[PDB]
Amino acid sequence: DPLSETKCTLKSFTVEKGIYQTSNFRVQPTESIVRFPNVTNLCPFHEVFNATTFASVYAWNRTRISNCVADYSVLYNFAPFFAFKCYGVSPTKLNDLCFTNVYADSFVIKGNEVSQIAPGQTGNIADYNYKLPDDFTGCVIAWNSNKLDSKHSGNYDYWYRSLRKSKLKPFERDISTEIYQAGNKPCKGKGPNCYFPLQSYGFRPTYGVGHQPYRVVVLSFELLHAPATVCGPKKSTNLVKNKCVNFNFNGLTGTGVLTKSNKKFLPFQQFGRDIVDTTDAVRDPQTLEILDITPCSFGGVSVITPGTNTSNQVAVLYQGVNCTEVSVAIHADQLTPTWRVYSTGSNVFQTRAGCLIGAEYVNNSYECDIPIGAGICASYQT
Amino acid sequence: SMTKTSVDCTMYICGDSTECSNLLLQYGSFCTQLKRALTGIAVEQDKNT
């Protein structure tokens, strides 16, 4: 009850006369709603992961995945998952986010070169074949492909860049066949100080596991909430207005009441931000509606006691909130401090300082005893 | 006098987030101090008037 919360705030069983800012009240969301676009066609992950032929590591194959629902449960079906390293995103949450785009970088490397496919790594493949950015966000999936990328006489169709003048920049592909030059003497062909940058892998089934061919796909994401586009498989629910809810607009999670807005978004604008960069309005993915977002009602809770030795009765001030919203919150048990003070109809008074419950507003005027605010005071009187 | 303000640490720092509030409990009584200072300032404003 409010008096016990006062006692725990003061850390004493004895409370003196006064008004104590005890806690904070928040109205709680009643429902959770998710809004996701029309999209139902599954993303072509099978085509990228089960392609008949894979490009060389120095010529890594870039595939664009957009305008589809990204169901990652398919990835678990056709993959032993030798490596499933998701950097910057929790893999178990991959079904819950919307990504602006998906980029699938598919290539084939050696088994021991899998660890080189990571930001900040060093090595032949990392520096001369495929380099990830320092702030890379996405996932890297590596799985053995010996049964499909090996030949008895040797699979020489796969080549890797072993020598280069400078280390490869992030998201940079080098396909030049110019002979590497060591020093200042120009190279006109194979010979002294001249070596071919591209070396054939020569994958063979008889080779060891660490030398067996491995297919590696890097899934690069751009987690921006403005373009939305590709999200996972969540069933969107109905939209409710004028009710404090947990809303999920295309991955943008929040809590508040969504109301009809007079704000006119230009066709390219997807959401609105207040002057201090707080989201103020949003666009419905389905109905293309401009919804004003207002956070659920909250404020401070003060307890007015006449002293614990004089009496155990208390009054409660919900600061800066209408008595109607408070009463509605009790009637729908949405208020956070759940020790509701009994209301008699005359117990509820509307001050400019907030809503006062548990004190009776008399029409006389006395010297202030416990200052409530805005010219209103409270006292223990007959 | 000047404007009396009240700040909620849990709402300002870890707004309606249980994980963040549990992590914030590990910093001790910084917010008891902040709330006490602000309450003193407000009561002092009323005293000034």
Partner: peptide, 29 residues
């Protein structure tokens, strides 16, 4: 003379009314 105010009120930052209203200050003066 004394939205920025709504946005402030939206993250734990509230403003408490003074105990004496402008009418009482005017009465005292």
């Amino acid at each position: 003379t004394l939205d920025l105010i709504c946005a402030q009120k939206f993250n734990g930052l509230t403003v408490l009314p003074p105990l004496l209203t402008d009418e009482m200050i005017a009465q005292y003066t």
